[PDB]
Design a protein around this ligand. Structure first.
Ligand code: WXS
Length: 167
């Protein structure tokens, strides 16, 4: 038993809800919240901008030191950093950005990072401003992640479409 509430169960291990991931993190304080990161951990907009704003820019400060020490992530890769006031940990995962021409097959590799964590609160990777088809992202999530994932979909219209079209 865990504290996630109001989710629709899609599969044995995947759950979905129309929610703001920032507000969901602040209420659940999950062990892991996933950020829709880029390789530079520049948290400007989308999910990343919103999570970082909710940390009063502490996520960005921590991220800049991480990059200064380690260099950029790989597309499809991840790193674990602090969850600040939102979660114990933040798993920063880089899905391919279609608006940069990145290979969409890297979406499966990106979701594989979720399997290193028993339970996660997450957005759909490569959705929103990363330009991928969210229906496809949900399919890859279901077919790749084996651990327990709670997906927050900000937009109510998209949430309903994701549920209604789910196979
Ligand atoms: C736009 C975007 O940018 C990013 O990096 O990921 C996403 C995923 S959609 C999203 N955008 C904002 N708040 C949310 N809460 C739950 N899903 C979302």
């Amino acid at each position: 038993v865990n504290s996630f509430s109001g989710y629709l169960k899609l599969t044995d291990n995947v759950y979905i809800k129309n929610a703001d991931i920032v507000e969901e993190a602040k209420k659940v304080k999950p062990t892991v919240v996933v950020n829709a990161a880029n390789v530079y951990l520049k948290h400007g907009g989308g999910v990343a901008g919103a999570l970082n704003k909710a940390t009063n820019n502490a996520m960005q400060v921590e991220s800049d030191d991480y990059i200064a020490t380690n260099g950029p992530l790989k597309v499809g890769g991840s790193c674990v950093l602090s969850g600040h006031n939102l979660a114990k940990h933040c798993l920063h995962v880089v899905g391919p950005n279609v608006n940069k021409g990145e290979d969409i097959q890297l979406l499966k590799s990106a979701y594989e990072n979720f399997n290193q964590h028993e339970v996660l609160l997450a957005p759909l990777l490569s959705a929103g401003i990363f330009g991928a088809d969210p229906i496809h992202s949900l399919r890859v999530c279901v077919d790749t992640v084996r651990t327990n994932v709670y997906l927050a979909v900000f937009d109510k219209n998209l949430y309903d479409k994701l549920v209604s079209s789910f196979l």
